[PDB]
Swiss-Prot record:
EC number per UniProt: 3.2.1.17
PROSITE patterns in the record: GLYCOSYL_HYDROL_F22_1, GLYCOSYL_HYDROL_F22_2
Name of the protein described by the UniProt record: Lysozyme C
Cystine pairs: 6-128, 30-116, 65-81, 77-95
Keyword field: Amyloid, Amyloidosis, Antimicrobial, Bacteriolytic enzyme, Disease variant, Disulfide bond, Glycosidase, Hydrolase, Secreted, Signal
Summary of subunit composition and partner proteins: Monomer.
Entry's Gene Ontology cellular component terms: azurophil granule lumen; extracellular exosome; extracellular region; extracellular space; specific granule lumen; tertiary granule lumen
Subcellular location: Secreted
The UniProt record lists the keyword Secreted: yes
Gene for this chain: LYZ
Lineage: Eukaryota, Metazoa, Chordata, Craniata, Vertebrata
Pfam family, one: Lys
Amino acid sequence: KVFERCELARTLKRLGMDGYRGISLANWMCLAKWESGYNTRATNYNAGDRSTDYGIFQINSRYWCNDGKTPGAVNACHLSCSALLQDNIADAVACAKRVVRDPQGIRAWVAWRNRCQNRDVRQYVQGCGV
């Protein structure tokens, strides 16, 4: 499923993402925008290290979810990577919350540093009623 901007904003707020571990809703939106374009089916294979990024937040298979074909997999979210490709983003959100519980927080995603950090991210939630 490809979410409409405000539809996703309201969904994430209901799932308790606003202010989770100090991260504003606009930051989560900025992350989803640049990682997958709000697409739950997005998948990116990293030929360099044999890992794959899954879903709307592009969660990696080496540390977070299990896909069975990634060497040195940890599976910290205790989820099959298949769960991160559903239209229902509940599992993806639960795993994203786990990612930010680590020291790096939202900085765990390089795209956030490049496209969201120190920027005016209000545009991502403007007019959504959140």
